[PDB]
Subunit: 340 residues, 6 copies
């Protein structure tokens, strides 16, 4: 957990994040050409950052956002496929792990159902070792089919990694889910468009803190014909302090070393802010002093989670009362989104 | 949701938060004397802030922290009791609602079990309308008996209010639970000691954003013989932007107007960042476009919450593997906290 | 007055501001081509921001700065004209109002007098509803003919709008003049070159506060052969707090919702910081308590404004004593600017 | 215009500002005792800051705020009087100029009309050389009789000084009026209570910039039974950059050196941001190039100022349409302030 | 190197720094009484921070600044002496190391020469293990006799510690000297008075970076009759990033864990920003590639240091040409400091 | 020392710094073409900044970084040479001094030894008046031959200038060496790649303060195939306060006026923070009061500098004990850098 050098040691994973300029593409050939530009970038970056063990690119960095539905279906990727092979070759040549984005990934029922929005973690031998599908697409605008699962994978130097995508990170539940599965680094890849710049910078830091986890964010930059993306790719320590952060600049890079021993030492020995531990051992001091054993209280005291798990339809009905009953609003209608 | 004036309107709730200097007390008589100082402060503040509808004091602002166990038991409050009556009279005289702290509140089995750490919301007629007991005491140091329930109460001008305490706010689950019960303002009262100043400032803002809720924080200040408290009492908008924030100064005050219509308009009409709505209607656009109905997906996709709700002991066992198995650590032992 | 979403409601005007990359143009054909790029950008942005009701482009975003005098005269626009028709079509297609820049607009005595530096507000039906000519050109460098009038126009959802340009905003008088005419949003369009980046960021916020008015700023970006423009387009609340702000990035966008009801509620009910009201009712409490009626004092107590209005030549003579008597300085001479 | 040292030179005026802790006083004897504490503080500060030429205390630093009307009248000061003599002796002993606050100063018709809220500038020989009465009392709460005049006085080393008070500084007109009278330093003394902390910090800087003037702010601190005062006393350069700024701490001090030659050199030779010059020579380049002489345009183009000067009652009527017609609001009533 | 918890581990040294309120004392009895208050504070802090291994108090925290020469001599301490014994007992009772200030420490020729300004490092067994005398007193105001030596001492858990005082830290040479002796933590104790608040915050961070060293700063707070002290006690990582920082509040505390293994791993394996290594192996890559061996260049290329070491009188003469020849200036005279 | 205007006076040097976009070049013809682009930029900037007296471009702005060894040797420049003549013509035409980068400059033994990394200062008559070779190349990556000398040159309006390059600025010794030679402005030209953005921003400010010197930084921007450069070109006052600073934007420019009289007045009359003076007159007050003469102590008290000057090999051996013995590390090997 230290910032400023280009090296890494047996204790540290050298992580690079990329403010990748958002592509404006339309065809499979264009996507392939851009995939090879990403590959060239990985290999060049390694020449400058000899400590690099993990390189992270934004959501949409391969395809851009395929606004046209026909182009969306025509450019939807197979995984593994040609794009991933191109990335895998760069990971091998540069002896680094990498996180890349396929938007979309063909649905099982392609082309009759919406593609997934997908991340892969590729190891330094070119093997895909995690494939994550976005659980919370950025509706209403995003039409991707939602995924349903988080994963944890042993990463470079044994650092445990989970992937999440963009809108996912607004929801503290996903970060919690990953950390509770044992994640030591949560990688948030995004094409996060303005307006919500400051909110997203703050969210990543707050989630690093709340879940005692390293966080790396790669966010797109530039204007793509529709959105302007605000960058601020970052690596953040498990104590909630930014290691390094980019500005809004096209193809900015940040690089930091995250210590394997430090996070494990903290998770073992931290007390007042060992949030993962404390959530499942509430009021331990009080119970000890009250003659009630030495483990605190594990039981979930929050009705929302009990209801959501038991009766998701009831939780949905409850939230519609507080918000609205239809996915769209007649005050700001969107074609294909019902309202009223 | 606006800041800078001392007024309030039929649309806005005028909220004041107090950087109350942490008392260093030892006896019931001293606690009573300090309760009357708080009462005098409420009445004086109202003279300067004619818009004030809600005034918020820090956790521990009534008793301070009773480090001595005998003094802790001797000063534990009844609710309702003498302290609350003193506060209630000030709320009536100043025609304001108030949030006050009783640390401790007598356990049902007093003095044979640890007291609770408790907040009350008192209305402008002097009636206690919410009583909240801290669900996550700040272990290891805090020996309070943990509470088990969150509440929502109709507040001034119909603004829906939930109370939480200090360490509670590190855990996104509690903020979620309150907002999903319909809370429009979450009031976090704290005696939040250094070190974790910047982390706590960031958490409140991030939670305001994540849960589309107004947030008010009152935090103690000064040195009490053991801890120094970092202040930064604040009122924050539902869009994650600070309204007003104090520094670390003793008896600082902030004051802001929170609009009832604005939060309700947002919760109805916001789309891309309507987090409460979107969490229970995931990927609605994708499902519509895939011919699968117009509600998105409600089901909880996060195994941690499913496991915690179904089998809290399993969730506890899982987290002990990632952290440690005993509440204490032999590397930093604490008397009365078992380890090793 | 809220930030982070892409929606808007019947209560809120969705405002987008654009960090438009400064063009480097030389011919009428090039200007037309760039006008169509702006039009394409408006239509694309609306696809991503369905709440958008108003889109704002920087001063000079259509022509760039025509440094060459011959090119300046050759590219000076008619209003209405071809450029405005191109913009009007985009406003109609995207169902949004827009603010666009014509630099220059032909003088009545074209080509024998300097063109104006002009903004138009175009409604969602493609109609020009305000035309503003820069009252304070950025002399010495800017050679535009000064305008003489501010305007207020009913805008989207009835939001009252005034336009001002770049250097204008350094002078608190213009913001005052607009707000006192009833403006609820002041739109500052600029091609504000470095050096004065931080000063301009601060000015917009301070003027929002001082005049209890929403402020939107669109500023150019990039290097154009002569100047580098610092971006930081922004939308600011009437309470002086930034809603959203861009960085220095080319073609950054910000977007915020400004509430019609909130500003009107504030202007009615705010007291201590109701600056528009208080300026014309000074010391009302004192006069009441002194038996002198209940309106305070309206009379202007500032000799500078009395003198400027009555005897502008005297005010000019007075200021020349404090500064210098000639428009140029021999210590930093500029061709065509007399000194010495 | 430089910060960090305790010295001053023949070119620089050493200015100290004081975050003076707000007194809570009730009697004339208490006021006198506090005046002598201020005097002792002046003499001590000079021992530590040998460059000090000017020392500035907050509005209300002598009396505190006399909330009780009877006490207000009983403690209203004569000027010159006992309090000013006490201050004058300290200025002589410490060989410094000083700015002090008398709240109230007896009205000409004392005790039958409200006192003034007054500042004095005392020179190093103990002579009162400026007496300023607050033109914009902070209504509704403040009941002081409004003053009607700004002043400029030759200060230490010939630095030209104007005094303004607290609420005055929210109104850009007063800063303009002082600078146009030739002020080189505007001293804003305040007892500026929370909420509006960030807005006031920003205002002082923005006004320094807009009027090309040094600014010194002394603001009170602490809680006085009614308000908490936010400090942030500051000295700011004529280029809008803070020299030094205090936090919210009780009895904080800042100290900076302001160069006489620098401001005079700037006012002579600055061009693009010579705001005082440019306001009265608008569009000079354009007029030259259009064959219309070399002075630009002086005439006031802002109808608000023309109307206010000619017909203040009309300006008042106009603003009441935009705000409200009565000084009070029935939505937030205040005893003695009419509404409805 | 992590922040937020109250614990520490076998790998981390738990460091607390104290914003100690500056005493205003006059007699030996008063100094002793205050020393016991510091002792009580150490023991209380340990109850709240069970990880604490090192506690740091400001320069002057024991005596305050003895402005009166007679009182200065009467209160000058012996080391070891009564004050240090009081501190030593607290270190033993709280099982912590501590850094304390003796101002003054009796000169060898007391009372005929000025006392030293001195820090002691006391271990958890109550033994004084380092005594440092300020090498750069804060002249002209400070009249302490200058010390001449820096030290490095094995500290808690083997962390190597050097002490420096206040004004010392403005001079990069002292930080370099300590780090090159092997220091892993440089402790800067200060009574750093306003004006130079922001400069001092920045210096500590910059020196942490430049010397790849942990830095802890304890600074005084409050007003002492002459100066106001700006606090901002801090612990900073060897990568230049703040761990935790106080504000200006009286008796603020910060606490952070500094990893022994992290700094040693960095000093071994860092490359591009291994400043200690690189300074003595300049251009190693270039020399290798030029066929000139594999060590780079060690020789000092800076004439100033060569001259200062060889001919300090020449270096002094050189600097007097750039500045002034006498220690005082007639433009800002100070009694006892010659000028002219 | 003032910021915001485009003018300059007889007292001020108008300094422009350029966030020049990093070139990606391969051939001599490409370098020449880019040199002419820089020349065109100088002439254009002068049209917009009539006060400009000095223009500063980043290290590598002429060649980019020649990663290919063959291309490095093929494009190594003669000085004076074709590139410098191109720059000299622009300086003459625009009547400005300029700082330009030649990377590499041919070694005396070209092409058999590594080129130098070189800056030239060219006056307004096109004459090269300083040539500086980087003393601390950014090893391990940079293979330039190290230079050995700093210089001071009389610059525009007599302002004394020293040049340093990029990695040089991490080492406080070089800034000290320049200031002690009489430098009034230190110009740091850099191609400073991410990661170390915040550290470099802080270093420049801290060095301005520590050495009481103006500082100008020009840093590259953009991605060049290997590194992304973080911009933040800046001009900083001798009191450590930023005048103007760029963001990370490609071809950003900042411009500020630095006063000749202000720095000379400060160096003469400053006392408490006259660091250049005080370093060579330590404890003057103490020695005076102790009867030991009126000059303080000049002797160097820091063993590191004494050892480095006398026995550089010993200093190297000492530092290898604290860090590592070989220039490379087997934990992060780099081809051509020995380790193990």
């Amino acid at each position: 957990m230290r910032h400023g050098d280009i090296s890494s040691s047996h204790d540290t994973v050298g992580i690079a994040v990329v403010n990748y300029k958002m592509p404006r593409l339309h065809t499979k050939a264009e996507v392939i050409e851009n995939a090879k530009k990403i590959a060239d970038m990985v290999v060049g970056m390694k020449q400058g950052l000899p400590g690099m063990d993990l390189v992270v690119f934004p959501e949409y960095s391969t395809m851009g956002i395929m606004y046209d539905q026909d182009e969306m279906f025509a450019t939807a990727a197979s995984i593994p496929g040609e794009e991933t092979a191109i990335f895998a070759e760069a990971c091998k040549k540069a002896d680094t792990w990498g996180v890349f984005s396929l938007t979309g990934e063909k649905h099982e029922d392609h082309p009759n159902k919406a593609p997934y929005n997908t991340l892969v973690l590729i190891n330094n031998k070119g093997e895909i070792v995690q494939k994550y599908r976005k659980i919370i697409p950025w509706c209403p605008i995003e039409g991707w089919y939602p995924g349903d699962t988080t994963y944890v994978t042993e990463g470079p130097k044994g650092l445990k990694i989970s992937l999440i995508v963009c809108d996912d990170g607004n929801y503290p539940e996903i970060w919690r889910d990953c950390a509770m599965k044992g994640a030591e680094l949560i990688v948030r890849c995004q094409g996060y468009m303005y307006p919500a710049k400051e909110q997203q910078i703050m969210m990543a830091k707050a989630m690093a803190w709340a879940n005692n986890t390293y966080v790396a964010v790669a966010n797109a930059t530039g204007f793509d014909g529709v959105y302007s993306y605000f960058g601020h790719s970052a690596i953040i320590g498990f104590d909630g302090r930014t290691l390094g952060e980019c500005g809004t600049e096209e193809n900015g890079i940040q690089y930091a070393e995250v210590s394997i021993s430090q996070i494990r030492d903290f998770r073992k020995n931290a007390q007042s802010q060992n949030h993962l531990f404390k959530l499942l051992h509430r009021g331990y001091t009080g119970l000890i002093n009250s003659g009630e054993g030495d483990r605190g209280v594990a039981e979930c005291p929050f009705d929302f989670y009990r209801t959501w798990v038991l009766d998701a339809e009831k939780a949905r009905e409850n939230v519609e009362k507080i918000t609205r009953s239809t996915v769209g609003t007649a005050e700001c209608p969107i074609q294909g989104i019902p309202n009223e």
